[PDB]
Ligand binder design. Structure first.
Ligand SMILES: CCCCCCCCO[C@@H]1O[C@H](CO)[C@@H](O)[C@H](O)[C@H]1O
Ligand SMILES: CCCCCCCCO[C@@H]1O[C@H](CO)[C@@H](O)[C@H](O)[C@H]1O
Ligand SMILES: CCCCCCCCO[C@@H]1O[C@H](CO)[C@@H](O)[C@H](O)[C@H]1O
Ligand SMILES: CCCCCCCCO[C@@H]1O[C@H](CO)[C@@H](O)[C@H](O)[C@H]1O
Ligand SMILES: CCCCCCCCO[C@@H]1O[C@H](CO)[C@@H](O)[C@H](O)[C@H]1O
Ligand SMILES: CCCCCCCCO[C@@H]1O[C@H](CO)[C@@H](O)[C@H](O)[C@H]1O
Ligand SMILES: CCCCCCCCO[C@@H]1O[C@H](CO)[C@@H](O)[C@H](O)[C@H]1O
Ligand SMILES: CCCCCCCCO[C@@H]1O[C@H](CO)[C@@H](O)[C@H](O)[C@H]1O
Ligand SMILES: CCCCCCCCO[C@@H]1O[C@H](CO)[C@@H](O)[C@H](O)[C@H]1O
Ligand SMILES: CCCCCCCCO[C@@H]1O[C@H](CO)[C@@H](O)[C@H](O)[C@H]1O
Ligand SMILES: CCCCCCCCO[C@@H]1O[C@H](CO)[C@@H](O)[C@H](O)[C@H]1O
Ligand SMILES: CCCCCCCCO[C@@H]1O[C@H](CO)[C@@H](O)[C@H](O)[C@H]1O
Ligand SMILES: CCCCCCCCO[C@@H]1O[C@H](CO)[C@@H](O)[C@H](O)[C@H]1O
Ligand SMILES: CCCCCCCCO[C@@H]1O[C@H](CO)[C@@H](O)[C@H](O)[C@H]1O
Ligand SMILES: CCCCCCCCO[C@@H]1O[C@H](CO)[C@@H](O)[C@H](O)[C@H]1O
Ligand SMILES: CCCCCCCCO[C@@H]1O[C@H](CO)[C@@H](O)[C@H](O)[C@H]1O
Ligand SMILES: CCCCCCCCO[C@@H]1O[C@H](CO)[C@@H](O)[C@H](O)[C@H]1O
Ligand SMILES: CCCCCCCCO[C@@H]1O[C@H](CO)[C@@H](O)[C@H](O)[C@H]1O
Ligand SMILES: CCCCCCCCO[C@@H]1O[C@H](CO)[C@@H](O)[C@H](O)[C@H]1O
Ligand SMILES: CCCCCCCCO[C@@H]1O[C@H](CO)[C@@H](O)[C@H](O)[C@H]1O
Ligand SMILES: CCCCCCCCO[C@@H]1O[C@H](CO)[C@@H](O)[C@H](O)[C@H]1O
Ligand SMILES: CCCCCCCCO[C@@H]1O[C@H](CO)[C@@H](O)[C@H](O)[C@H]1O
Ligand SMILES: CCCCCCCCO[C@@H]1O[C@H](CO)[C@@H](O)[C@H](O)[C@H]1O
Ligand SMILES: CCCCCCCCO[C@@H]1O[C@H](CO)[C@@H](O)[C@H](O)[C@H]1O
Ligand SMILES: CCCCCCCCO[C@@H]1O[C@H](CO)[C@@H](O)[C@H](O)[C@H]1O
Ligand SMILES: CCCCCCCCO[C@@H]1O[C@H](CO)[C@@H](O)[C@H](O)[C@H]1O
Ligand SMILES: CCCCCCCCO[C@@H]1O[C@H](CO)[C@@H](O)[C@H](O)[C@H]1O
Ligand SMILES: *C(=O)CCCCCCCCCCCCCCC
Ligand SMILES: *C(=O)CCCCCCCCCCCCCCC
Ligand SMILES: *C(=O)CCCCCCCCCCCCCCC
Lengths: 455, 455, 455
């Protein structure tokens, strides 16, 4: 029989609904198709990104280690499941000993000999009180936990590839913007040099143009480096080189992601892989309490073989030399100086530790999803404000330029307007990147992209 | 007897006093009430923060795992302490075997049978040279180490909750400042629109006001997000929701912390929990050398039972069927092909590793405390300078505004002054946050807040 | 015999050459003296840095733990290598038991006794199918892996000490620059106060000078703190205090590093320590497959002693009381309910996991080296651009100042020029630091500085 305690899922120590406030929209509530069911093929619209995610799914080495781990823990479960059954082997044994007279059978010193070849089992533990089965069930729960760990690793890898691709694309946009602004500054500096060679443009205007040109050159080199390093990061995350015939990707100003629902927090318990990993770890910890308990009950062992035995090696397998052995044992502990009780306390404390860690997994998932929702409820406003700021700075630069052709202004206000426009556009690229990254992380936290197509 | 080497605490490989220089004040020297004795109820003046720290102390799941760990290592010590005593059980044994004629007692093939029920101990190791006791003492030292680990986890959690609360408060202040500055910019933009509709204000002034308004709007959205995310972070660190009836908190411009003393570096050895954890780990490593050594001396074992035995099952417990067994053993190793010596080398290298790790713990604590002191000796000057900068920028903005009502200046100098004032105030909030965080981390490094009230 | 599979190094899952693009120079190809052979005494020209690296090599505690680890894994290999040979000990045994009549030799209840002192081995496993040798070879491969781990730790420590020294030096330069700019601002503010007391300088100019002075004061305090904290970081990385009589160091504007070659990616396989660590881990995983396999073949055991035995304690060691025992065993498993097969699957999956982790080590090294090359191919351009920007801002400030002595400009353009110059110089210091750090990390990734002199 089995001494495992009944397993009861701990209550989620999180609020019943995601936090509401100035940064949060209205709670959508229960979703018909939850985020974890929305495949990454549908969440990510960019087909090049989809083919890259597929390349990573099939070539990233960390995900490969995760899948191998599932296989190893399945082996371990299988090793524990086998230990229930008697191990049956062939045993060849010989014994040849000299013995002094007071211990020999003859009364004088003697050389005795004995030989046997038997088929049987030694010290087989008859799982009467479920110790071995408890250990099997803990192995099984740790294996299910490893499976959930693989699914979590995949969601992590998907989000990592998306973020690497988006970061490379954003830095490529920054590089292009810097190229355009450097070309503008270089044209302006050459015109100002020609106007200074004729005594019209002052040295002040020329030096300010030169500062603008050098600053743009330095930022150009910086973003050139960042673009190459983002390529390297993406190649590492893919586990393979970038394919040559990739489909056409979408630019940052397109709709790149599907707006995934928030759902209820409780959905996480059933749909977020690392929470299910935590829960299977807890169910294993619980399973091991059965073993700790079974130790106090009687242990039943059996040693049994059948085969041939003889005093002479020449008499083996020979008619009239058959032998067999049946040897049962029971052991009931009485006194261990508190050992068995301390072992059971250990088992119980382990269950408690796993309870705390499952609860902490739930709280961490809640915090990550609430942070994603606070980012969803504010990046739209911040991006509208940043688009309006880019527009207003462009209007101001165009007005200063239309005033410049009629003189009036000096060659400082125009450079200031251009610098502010460049900074505003860099910040707009960065903000778009941050909004896309927050949305990807929210998809991951809700249940991620374990599915390729939507279930 | 016991072969554990004498334990001698390694010398602290740090300077005798904290580093002195331009960033450090004068060394206060030995403190009457050291930082580790100052309770977190006294260190933190904000009563809302105190109630939040209490909520975290009773609901954070990592601290719960730490406390459970102390209990598990205590179980393990108890399991090792029991192994000294003989395990006494009841043993039921049966043996029924067929044997060929040349091996049977009758000279022809025979079925013999034997049964016994005894009370006794099997293979009990008489701890003569202290092997088992060495292992017990290593278990005990690892348990004391786990206790110190819990205390370190609590200090870490206290500092983390303080820093989360201060970060939420600072970002709320940034949000309020941004609201005020956005309202000012919006009033100014509406007045400039009305002045432009009558041909008085130029399009340049209007576009610059619009850029200011959009920038403030974007920063407003950003800080709105940060405030919500800081709330989420704090809720995760509490392990529970924020309580509704919290006392009134103190604002950032108040005195939030007590200035804790620096003390001597040596104080750390006796008062910083992770150093004591390291030292108990080392004392355990040392304890295990006793076991490694005891292996070379004789091992003494005893098997002893008393009970009933009989050739027939029907003859058990029956008068004249009593039996008893006394079976001692000594084993002295002679040749192991260097095994035992390599085992002892392993034990000794482990002691050495723990020595290095205790020393590294001391050096790390010294570096953290010296960094806290370098922050204490400079944040005051930086905060004075930043207050003076905010004041000077406010004077400049007020003078530009008092000049604006009489025309003279354009609608660009005023916006520049307002932008500089806003940036200076943001930096002042950030600097106050950094000073408070550095002070909290210094309290943690010195010995933290294991005590609630001052001892 | 041995059932270990043949070991075949996995193909490098990286491109045949480092990535080429706008941020990368032309591939130098195979180097005559590869980076891993260039000693850190030659790579780092600053002799003070060399003496500091030596101090860290001999006093850093993490590197000490790494070296101790090599010694511990060597002990473990030695413990496994010994297990091949029979453990020979002296065995003292006694047995005194009462037995009921139906089981005694006399037919009535009897007390029998037996004593022996023998020299021999018990249950010695004759490594016929290489199980023990397989475990030895896995121990040996894990030891070689630990050796490579030490070398990687040293390269890491060297790069960490270089980066700590360069960061301290850069922040000291920032502190000196801030001191100079604060002195300039203070002189200018005092002159403006004297010019305002006579009604010449406006309050606007005075307030703007005061803002500049306070900003410089705050930045001064910040960099003062950073310098002290960098000192603390360096002291922690050294494991010892800074020596007093250090040689003269080189300034940031000097040539501090030797430009190390890139070489081929394949060079990493043979020259980067953590890849060789990964490979030895894989060779160990492979080695353990031999043990998993050997389990299925017959196990051969021997128990053999020679000594004295007697029915009376007084008859030991006595002429005619010699005895000896020769007891061989063979065990061939037949049925284990899939256990042995699951054990072999486990071994094989472990080999596969180590394959994936070695491949991932190769890909990570490639990405780190490609990032170092993308930094090498762009920091030169960015630093030229930043020097030109500092020069142009200095020209602009000098022209504005030469115009100021003849009045014309107000006391705002000069402060703006000074602020831009200060920011440009800070960014130039930061860029030089980043270029030096990237070059150090590239040296580490290529093979680091395991050698002191060049091999
Ligand atoms: C003589 C051998 C009998 C050994 C007892 C076997 C105990 C069987 O145990 C059963 O095995 C199944 C899979 O193995 C599982 O489905 C059951 O849950 C499990 O209880
Ligand atoms: C025919 C042998 C019966 C074995 C005793 C009970 C073992 C229970 O074990 C079950 O035995 C089944 C076959 O009997 C197998 O198909 C199952 O895999 C196994 O779980
Ligand atoms: C007649 C009494 C028979 C005793 C046989 C079983 C004794 C079990 O002992 C009990 O086992 C429990 C585990 O489930 C533990 O919780 C208890 O602490 C332990 O006392
Ligand atoms: C591993 C199984 C070992 C037990 C196999 C023995 C099967 C039954 O044992 C039989 O019992 C009879 C009388 O009791 C004898 O006459 C037979 O010789 C004997 O084989
Ligand atoms: C020449 C090398 C071969 C060595 C033979 C080893 C086998 C030893 O032979 C032994 O000798 C005994 C006599 O004392 C015989 O009675 C035994 O039957 C036999 O086991
Ligand atoms: C595997 C061990 C099985 C060996 C079979 C032993 O031998 C068998 O048992 C008796 C002894 O010879 C004989 O009576 C049988 O005829 C013989 O086949
Ligand atoms: C290494 C394992 C091989 C198995 C041994 C073959 C089985 C031996 O076979 C036996 O040999 C005896 C002669 O000694 C004969 O008396 C038996 O009839 C015969 O069955
Ligand atoms: C046959 C089993 C014997 C059980 C022996 C003692 C069981 C618990 O031990 C108790 O703990 C006390 C601690 O002071 C000891 O003094 C006593 O042995 C006993 O009262
Ligand atoms: C066979 C009896 C030998 C002497 C009995 C020693 C019993 C030791 O006493 C043990 O002390 C522990 C606390 O220290 C308790 O937890 C154990 O229950 C108790 O049995
Ligand atoms: C017959 C059982 C005797 C076993 C030897 C017991 C060894 C006792 O050992 C003692 O036990 C105490 C707590 O357990 C400790 O206070 C002592 O430091 C320890 O030496
Ligand atoms: C009464 C049994 C004596 C046991 C032999 C020495 C065991 C020493 O052990 C001690 O025994 C004490 C009771 O004697 C217990 O109170 C202690 O917990 C225990 O440490
Ligand atoms: C007459 C000689 C008696 C030998 C019995 C003990 C032999 C101990 O042997 C010694 O034990 C020490 C551990 O303390 C080790 O340091 C030594 O290397 C080992 O040789
Ligand atoms: C676990 C303890 C087992 C030993 C208990 C036996 C107690 C003493 O043993 C006694 O010795 C006497 C002569 O030597 C005999 O007359 C007694 O029958 C016998 O019980
Ligand atoms: C009908 C199902 C019950 C099976 C009974 C199993 C007990 C076997 O009974 C055995 O048989 C022997 C004869 O060879 C007896 O002499 C033994 O006393 C007995 O152990
Ligand atoms: C627990 C095992 C204890 C069983 C007690 C065995 O039986 C006891 O010993 C002898 C054999 O019967 C008799 O002389 C005693 O009267 C009897 O009580
Ligand atoms: C399962 C454990 C139960 C313990 C068995 C009860 C003890 C048996 O009791 C014994 O039974 C004998 C008859 O066979 C009698 O001769 C003995 O007098 C009686 O004490
Ligand atoms: C009874 C114990 C026997 C001890 C056997 C050898 C002890 C150490 O072994 C030594 O190492 C040498 C290595 O070349 C071997 O040649 C020799 O066996 C021996 O000199
Ligand atoms: C019983 C003797 C069997 C042959 C003796 C083999 C002894 C192996 O020699 C061993 O080699 C090691 C170095 O390799 C040494 O560290 C060991 O001390 C030495 O004993
Ligand atoms: C009687 C003792 C014999 C035990 C078998 C020893 C197996 C020897 O094994 C050999 O030992 C050497 C170092 O130990 C290695 O160089 C060899 O690779 C290894 O195969
Ligand atoms: C002289 C004892 C021979 C031991 C049997 C083969 C053991 C092989 O082992 C080798 O033995 C050599 C000495 O013989 C040692 O020098 C080597 O260290 C050892 O690897
Ligand atoms: C006459 C048949 C002799 C069987 C003795 C060895 C049986 C080995 O068995 C085989 O060992 C291999 C390991 O190398 C495994 O891959 C196989 O799965 C296993 O079946
Ligand atoms: C650990 C080694 C134990 C075996 C040592 C015994 C050496 C050889 O054994 C010899 O065999 C002869 C006949 O076979 C007898 O006359 C001798 O008395 C006996 O010593
Ligand atoms: C006075 C304290 C010393 C106790 C002596 C313990 C040794 C017990 O002495 C035993 O008694 C037997 C008689 O039954 C003798 O025949 C045995 O030779 C002897 O082992
Ligand atoms: C270590 C155990 C070795 C003890 C030696 C046993 O004693 C030896 O063997 C026989 C019995 O006395 C005698 O014939 C020998 O002369 C004697 O030296
Ligand atoms: C504790 C180990 C000490 C070893 C015991 C010394 C060896 C004993 O020596 C033996 O003593 C016998 C008397 O009993 C004599 O007959 C033997 O001649 C003598 O060799
Ligand atoms: C002497 C070794 C006995 C081998 C026993 C069975 C070996 C594999 O077991 C098989 O698996 C099936 C699962 O349904 C079981 O029904 C059967 O026992 C068997 O066909
Ligand atoms: C001695 C035979 C007792 C009954 C045989 C039970 C065999 C259990 O069957 C086992 O089931 C596993 C799948 O579940 C397979 O992987 C094993 O190969 C198979 O042997
Ligand atoms: C689940 O609750 C378990 C039920 C109780 C079973 C008790 C144990 C009986 C089996 C013992 C048979 C072993 C024979 C040994 C002969 C000396
Ligand atoms: C501490 O220094 C230990 C002191 C030395 C004690 C030596 C061992 C004596 C005990 C042996 C008794 C076992 C009897 C076995 C009978 C064959
Ligand atoms: C490598 O391929 C192994 C070769 C095959 C050797 C087979 C095993 C023979 C040794 C057995 C000797 C033990 C004697 C036991 C007596 C009953």
């Amino acid at each position: 029989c089995s001494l495992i305690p009944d397993y009861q899922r701990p209550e989620a120590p999180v609020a019943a609904a995601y936090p509401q406030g100035q940064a949060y929209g209205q709670n959508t509530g229960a979703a018909a198709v939850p985020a974890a069911d929305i495949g990454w093929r549908e969440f990510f619209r960019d087909p090049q990104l989809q083919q890259l995610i597929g390349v990573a799914l099939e070539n990233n080495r960390d995900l490969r280690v995760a899948a191998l781990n599932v296989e190893a823990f399945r082996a371990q479960y299988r090793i524990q499941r086998a230990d229930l059954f008697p191990r049956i082997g062939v045993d060849g044994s010989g014994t040849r000993q000299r013995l002094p007279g007071d211990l020999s059978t003859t009364g004088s010193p003697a050389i005795s000999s004995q030989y046997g070849v038997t088929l049987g089992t030694t010290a087989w533990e008859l799982d009467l009180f479920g110790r071995l089965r408890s250990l099997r069930d803990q192995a099984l729960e740790q294996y299910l936990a490893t499976e959930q760990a693989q699914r979590s690793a995949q969601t992590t890898l998907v989000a990592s590839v998306a973020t690497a691709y988006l970061t490379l694309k954003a830095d490529q946009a920054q590089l292009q913007l810097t190229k355009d602004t450097l070309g503008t500054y270089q044209k302006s500096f050459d015109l100002t040099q020609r106007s200074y060679d004729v005594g019209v443009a002052s040295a002040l205007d020329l030096r300010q143009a030169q500062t603008a040109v050098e600053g743009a050159r330095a930022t150009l080199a910086q973003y050139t480096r960042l673009v190459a390093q983002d390529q390297n990061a993406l190649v590492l995350l893919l586990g393979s080189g970038i394919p040559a015939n990739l489909p056409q990707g979408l630019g940052l100003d397109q709709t790149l992601l599907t707006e995934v629902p928030a759902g209820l927090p409780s959905d996480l318990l059933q749909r977020r892989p690392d929470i299910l990993e935590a829960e299977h770890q807890l169910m294993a910890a619980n399973a091991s309490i059965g073993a700790a308990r079974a130790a106090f009950f009687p242990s039943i062992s059996l040693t049994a073989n059948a085969g041939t035995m003889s005093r002479q090696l020449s008499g083996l397998f020979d008619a009239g030399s058959g032998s067999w052995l049946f040897q049962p044992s029971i052991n009931l502990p009485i006194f261990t100086a508190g050992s068995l009780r301390a072992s059971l306390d250990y088992a119980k404390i382990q269950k408690d530790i796993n309870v705390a860690q499952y609860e902490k997994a739930i709280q961490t998932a809640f915090q990550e999803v609430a942070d994603g929702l606070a980012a969803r409820g504010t990046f739209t406003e911040q991006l509208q404000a940043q688009r309006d700021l880019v527009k207003a700075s462009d209007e101001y630069y165009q007005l200063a330029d239309k005033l410049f052709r009629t003189g009036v202004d000096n060659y400082l206000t125009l450079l200031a307007a251009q610098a502010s426009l460049f900074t505003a556009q860099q910040q707009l690229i960065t903000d778009r990147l941050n909004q896309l990254t927050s949305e990807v992380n929210l998809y991951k936290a809700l249940g991620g992209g374990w599915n390729q197509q939507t279930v």
